[PDB]
């Protein structure tokens, strides 16, 4: 039978651990370096004679 | 009679000037690194037994 191999391996390095950061909605959020926001938005407007 | 003085001055260096950034208060708004949202405020809670 092919079975499912399994390595042993080390400890979890805490350098290795990045999801405590985007687990929830709001952190996924919290992670961005700044938010859209109505103000920061531009609107095109094409006048014709 | 004390008068007002006034100096003779050179040409205005385009590297002097700022204010074109900031004469509207939309653009005191853009001049911000990032926007104040609601989803940035975290509020305490003491909870008594």
Same mark, same amino acid.
């Given at each position: 039978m092919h079975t499912a191999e399994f390595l042993e391996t080390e400890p979890t390095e805490? %350098? %290795?651990?990045?999801?405590g950061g985007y687990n929830h909605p709001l952190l996924r959020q919290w992670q961005s370096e700044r938010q859209l926001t109505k103000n920061m938005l531009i609107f095109p407007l094409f006048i014709s004679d």
């Open positions: 805490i %350098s %290795s651990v990045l999801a």
